[PDB]
Design an enzyme around this catalytic site. Structure first.
Site, short mmCIF file in Angstrom:
data_model
loop_
_atom_site.label_atom_id
_atom_site.label_comp_id
_atom_site.label_asym_id
_atom_site.label_seq_id
_atom_site.Cartn_x
_atom_site.Cartn_y
_atom_site.Cartn_z
N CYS A 165 -52.12 -49.22 -23.19
CA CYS A 165 -53.21 -49.72 -23.99
C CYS A 165 -53.23 -51.23 -24.16
CB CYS A 165 -53.10 -49.09 -25.35
SG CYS A 165 -53.70 -47.40 -25.32
N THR B 268 -44.84 -43.77 -29.58
CA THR B 268 -46.31 -43.69 -29.62
C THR B 268 -46.88 -44.06 -31.01
OG1 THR B 268 -46.51 -41.33 -30.17
CG2 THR B 268 -46.00 -41.93 -27.91
N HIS C 124 -57.56 -53.71 -32.48
CA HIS C 124 -57.19 -52.74 -31.48
C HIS C 124 -58.01 -51.59 -32.03
CE1 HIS C 124 -54.84 -50.27 -28.73
NE2 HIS C 124 -54.58 -49.44 -29.72
N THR D 70 -57.46 -44.03 -35.13
CA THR D 70 -56.39 -43.08 -35.40
C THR D 70 -56.03 -43.41 -36.85
OG1 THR D 70 -54.66 -44.69 -34.81
CG2 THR D 70 -55.52 -43.19 -33.03
N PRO D 71 -55.64 -42.40 -37.61
CA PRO D 71 -55.32 -42.64 -39.01
C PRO D 71 -54.27 -43.75 -39.18
CG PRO D 71 -55.66 -40.30 -38.71
CD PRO D 71 -55.91 -40.97 -37.35
N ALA D 72 -53.07 -43.54 -38.64
CA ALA D 72 -52.01 -44.56 -38.76
C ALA D 72 -52.31 -45.87 -38.09
CB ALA D 72 -50.71 -44.05 -38.25
N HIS E 195 -61.90 -46.28 -26.94
CA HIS E 195 -60.83 -47.13 -26.45
C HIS E 195 -60.69 -47.05 -24.93
CE1 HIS E 195 -56.61 -48.34 -25.66
NE2 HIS E 195 -57.06 -49.37 -26.37
#
Ligand SMILES: *C(=O)CCCCCCCCCCC
Ligand SMILES: *C(=O)CCCCCCCCCCC
Lengths: 411, 411
Positions: free
Chosen positions: A162, A269, A302, A306-308, A339
């Site tokens: 990424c 991850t 970024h 995503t939650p976190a 993304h």
């Protein structure tokens, strides 16, 4: 002391197949997320993606030639010509030697890999195409381009998931600055919208599942987000040393002034709740660019939804800006595009560049109800006009806790 | 003006699972090429490879953990600890920030990719492991290591096929020299000895087929060669700035002094008959190291044992050395090991390093009847002793016509 500047842009995204169109759509707050129809998604938890619509390369690549190259490769070649034409640069014998490339991708030819593997399961090794290797390997975008344009300078390809787009560009800039090159086409390309891509990220439960509303699925920082949205595309830049550019009167979009990298050293991850690593990466770039957080007008998150992910990044921003926390503009184009994996940090570098040109800042669409402690201005819903924005910073973060940030400066 | 030096080595090769053992075997002219037994090779034109014998990581990686990582990842982690222990370096909070990684691979988790794809063909997406992505992606060796050793510095991963090992190391050195880091574990790891690897390179007719004599198959520059020989392994180095190393009394193997890159701009998998690109890459490194071809005592050939490959390289050597053409020692360890793809240029950097330490030069075994116009000293058959060798240069070249060379210097 070599100053690196941007003299050409090229792009293919889920909202346009040109730099200018993708930019227009992004400010207009257009989504590019659609439902997948190139493979049967019945068994799939996620059935949509940010896809490249009506892609054509016939003018650039013979069908004879396409057969030797995965879509990600095709995508990146197309986006590279875009960049090469746009640069105006003319390759000469007294030249080539000093023009190179730094283009990468997170996985590369996933499709042809699936194809050839399938073939091998059904027919045995005799079925594997003779172009299997060179059609899927990650460095083939730069391989083909350098060939097409007779480029003999340093060619590398960073595969940092990424973060690839950010790294390839940063190291392109480095290479030039070092003296190893004068020009470099750099960026990333991905097309992982496949069984293995969709299935894989869905196996990790990392993907959004809002199939009843694909365009709403990607909602960075919003309360109901449920994982990123996969997007295809390619974003290329032509970086070049200042003088070399002037001496040829090249049209200059902006100057690359900072580049920061870091490691999370946490999960393979997952981001620390901290954002500690993302902070360090932004931090390192500010110092490289030799400026202050107060100077950044716009940050390209970024912000994958995503939650976190989103919580951690926001944390980092606060940390880095603190005071300027609220005065700074942070936005996620991923809200419309999704993304783009390896292409992500490249396209977003181009956004950051255009945002300086046009003094405008793409919105974070879908941000209906933001998280709680958020003090930050995520440019929710609609584009924003700005006055004296001289710097924009662009973040990207990937698996293996690898982060990188780039700082762009006006004129 | 930051000088980069090597303070730790780590390796796993087809002739040893430690730095010192692989070195011993190489001088002894031992082959590591064996017949494949981990998959049915009946349908395969090539039935042997340079494999990693009796690999064990139980002490380094819990079985719980191995499940999340392709062999190439396991290989590289093991070889990284080797390097980290050997360095002696001790990571501290006031440290981490300044120690990073630059490790790559040509393809990465080909095995788990085949596994998961297979699964998906039989069971549907539900079968894809949740660790599919992070278990196969190329940057996970650096991801795991930085995590294991709490490293927060710049982490990148170059995927430039057969050149990866050279690039990752070169850019590690660069990064440090730039100031972005003080230490960097760098190198490459590959384990493409699979159906898709063997089948794929065999589809291109690039692989040797001497199944009646696996150990003789790899014969760089010899008249009867018929394509490279695939090898598995991993080669890691700990690069560090001179002062930082001294101030801690680190054992110093040698100093990295030059790094050259180039592009062939010719074919996507074929070298110009010229060797033009390989020349430019060696050339660029000599200038970076600020020295002359006359100064190189030993060159570590890419010399993969493909008909064109070997002719082209030899050409380049002549070009670069001309006079010193014959006085210089050129040898291919690939004659015993086979070609390690992404790991290749890393292991061979380690060879080049040890060759300076021990003033000895591994042979090109199997060189029974060399090609015709060859004026060069390929250290055929048996190791060679040397007197005052202060520099060794190591070449690697890959698909997309991407080349890179590294220059090592004594003490
Ligand atoms: C960002 O870090 C997400 C993971 C990047 C991996 C490369 C792209 C995914 C390929 C998907 C299965 C091989
Ligand atoms: C060197 O350039 C040879 C090709 C390098 C490709 C990466 C390793 C091969 C993977 C094989 C099939 C994916």
């Amino acid at each position: 002391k070599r100053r690196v500047v941007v003299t050409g842009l090229g792009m293919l995204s889920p909202v346009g197949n040109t730099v200018e169109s993708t930019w227009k759509a992004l400010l207009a707050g257009q989504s590019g997320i659609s439902l997948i129809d190139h493979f049967d998604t019945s068994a799939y938890a996620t059935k949509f993606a940010g896809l490249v619509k009506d892609f054509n390369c016939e003018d650039i690549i013979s069908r004879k030639e396409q057969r030797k190259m995965d879509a990600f490769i095709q995508y990146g070649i197309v986006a590279g010509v875009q960049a090469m034409q746009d640069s105006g640069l003319e390759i000469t014998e007294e030249n080539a030697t000093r023009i190179g490339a730094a283009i990468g991708s997170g996985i590369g030819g996933l499709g042809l890999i699936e194809e050839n593997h399938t073939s091998l399961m059904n027919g045995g090794p005799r079925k594997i195409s003779p172009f299997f290797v060179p059609s899927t390997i990650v460095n083939m975008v730069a391989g083909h381009l350098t060939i097409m344009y007779g480029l003999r300078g340093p060619s590398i390809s960073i595969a940092t998931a990424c973060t690839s787009g950010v790294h390839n560009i940063g190291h392109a800039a480095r290479i030039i600055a070092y003296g190893d090159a004068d020009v470099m086409v750099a960026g990333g390309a991905e097309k992982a919208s496949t069984p293995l891509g969709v299935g894989g990220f869905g196996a990790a439960r990392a993907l959004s599942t809002r199939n009843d509303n694909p365009q709403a699925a990607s909602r960075p920082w919003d309360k109901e987000r449920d994982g990123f949205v996969l997007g295809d595309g390619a974003g290329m830049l032509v970086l070049e040393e200042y003088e070399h550019a002037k001496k040829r009167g090249a049209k200059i979009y902006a100057e690359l002034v900072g580049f920061g990298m870091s490691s999370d050293a946490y999960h393979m991850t997952s981001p620390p709740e901290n954002g500690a690593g993302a902070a360090l990466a932004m931090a390192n770039a500010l110092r490289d660019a030799g400026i202050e957080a107060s100077q950044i007008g716009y940050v390209n998150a970024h912000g994958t939804s995503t939650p976190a992910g989103d919580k951690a990044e926001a944390q980092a921003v606060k940390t880095i800006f603190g005071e300027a926390a609220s005065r700074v503009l942070v936005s996620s184009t991923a809200s419309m595009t999704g993304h783009l994996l390896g292409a992500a940090g490249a396209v977003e570098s181009i956004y950051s560049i255009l945002a300086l040109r046009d003094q405008a800042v793409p919105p974070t669409i879908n941000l209906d109800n933001p998280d709680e402690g958020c003090d930050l201005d995520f440019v929710p819903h609609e584009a924003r006009q700005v006055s004296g924005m001289e710097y924009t910073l662009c973040n990207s973060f990937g698996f293996g806790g690898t982060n990188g940030s780039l700082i762009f400066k006006k004129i």
